[PDB]
């Protein structure tokens, strides 16, 4: 019977990095979803499992709002069956995805003049991520045959990389803020409907 906190996720002051992506569990709320169709601020709005237009007439058990920031070239990879550095090492989506993917450009926010290097992404990992997995491991990646005992160097690489987010980069290399909505429903009581 209360208002839904969706406004916190999209209008958040700061956004998390790709590998350490945030996740807001939402329950006991009511959302209309109309503010998401009508706003022309989103450069990409891809729902997969459900028709978003006929959503406020439905109800779900739990809706999860993932949020992070990626590069423009990576926005295509947030989708089922996708393959790439972001999809395999940072954030993977299941093939039977019942949700939506929203992305909008944020080069005016997440960009220092000399380059905002505070946004990171995992470029090294020895096994592809399972769907909805979240990896914070700082363990040094072992690329060569000789073991790396916590010391980096040749064939011993730090597993995280920094996005160079200058405002002079092309649209391909610009920060995009991404939100991923996931709708799940067991035979448990559904607690998030619409009007």
């Amino acid at each position, epitope marked *: 019977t209360n208002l839904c906190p969706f406004g916190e996720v999209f209008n958040a002051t700061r956004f998390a990095s790709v590998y350490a992506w945030n996740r807001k569990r939402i329950s006991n709320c009511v959302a209309d979803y109309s503010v998401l169709y009508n706003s022309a601020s989103f450069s990409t709005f891809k729902c*997969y499992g459900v028709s978003p*237009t006929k959503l406020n007439d439905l109800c779900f058990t739990n809706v999860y709002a993932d949020s992070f920031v990626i590069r423009g070239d990576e926005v295509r990879q947030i989708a089922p069956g996708q393959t790439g550095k972001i999809a395999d090492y940072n954030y993977k989506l299941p093939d039977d995805f019942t949700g939506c993917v929203i992305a909008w450009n944020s080069n005016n926010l997440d960009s220092k003049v000399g380059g905002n290097y505070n946004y990171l992404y995992r470029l090294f990992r020895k096994s592809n991520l399972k769907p909805f997995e979240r990896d914070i491991s700082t363990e040094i990646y072992q690329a060569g045959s000789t073991p790396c005992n916590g010391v980096e160097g040749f064939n011993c690489y730090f597993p995280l990389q920094s996005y160079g987010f200058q405002p002079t980069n092309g649209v391909g290399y610009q920060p995009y803020r991404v939100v991923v909505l996931s709708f*799940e*429903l067991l035979h448990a009581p559904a607690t998030v409907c619409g009007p």
Partner: antibody
Amino acid sequence: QMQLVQSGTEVKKPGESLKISCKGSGYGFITYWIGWVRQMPGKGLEWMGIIYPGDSETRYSPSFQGQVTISADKSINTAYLQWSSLKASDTAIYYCAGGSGISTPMDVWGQGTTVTVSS
Amino acid sequence: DIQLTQSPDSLAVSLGERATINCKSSQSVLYSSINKNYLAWYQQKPGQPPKLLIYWASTRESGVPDRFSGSGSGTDFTLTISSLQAEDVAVYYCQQYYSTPYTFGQGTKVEIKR
């Protein structure tokens, strides 16, 4: 609620190119995927392909792969379906349908574009 | 990929009587996450474009009168018109939206029996 509007009736000779359009008016268009359906005279519905305007993700049916070309223009909210060389067997009516998601039923339909190919 | 087969091709029922159309699938269409089968029923009148009647095989589009109902599960689905009226003479199709490529049914021609 938004709606779709297609181009006018076309009558071409065998061998000419053709590119019909389908523009959607109304708010809430960013979410809609647009698909093309072919209906031959007196025959059933045939799903040709689907496209997304935001990033031009295009998925063909196996029966129409390499036979047609589906394109988009997000600046004007218009999807396109084109032939390079029309055949007499392409004479049909082509609807454009719209679903607000990729794995979503086609909620909104166009009026249809009747294409006649004959010598 | 997925195949859909309807039955019957033509169906004639009197006014006010019940009309039944069956749609069989060559593959289970059930999104495991939410337990909603991705099956849809469309209506197409002569000269008209198709019109969506039922989605998720039991949920009905807004404005559709209370005489249309969808049922079924697994690979067997049914469309039922309770009180057949004159304005319902049309061709009815079933369509799956589990995975691309989308596929339609063969279509059922429904006329009035007199």
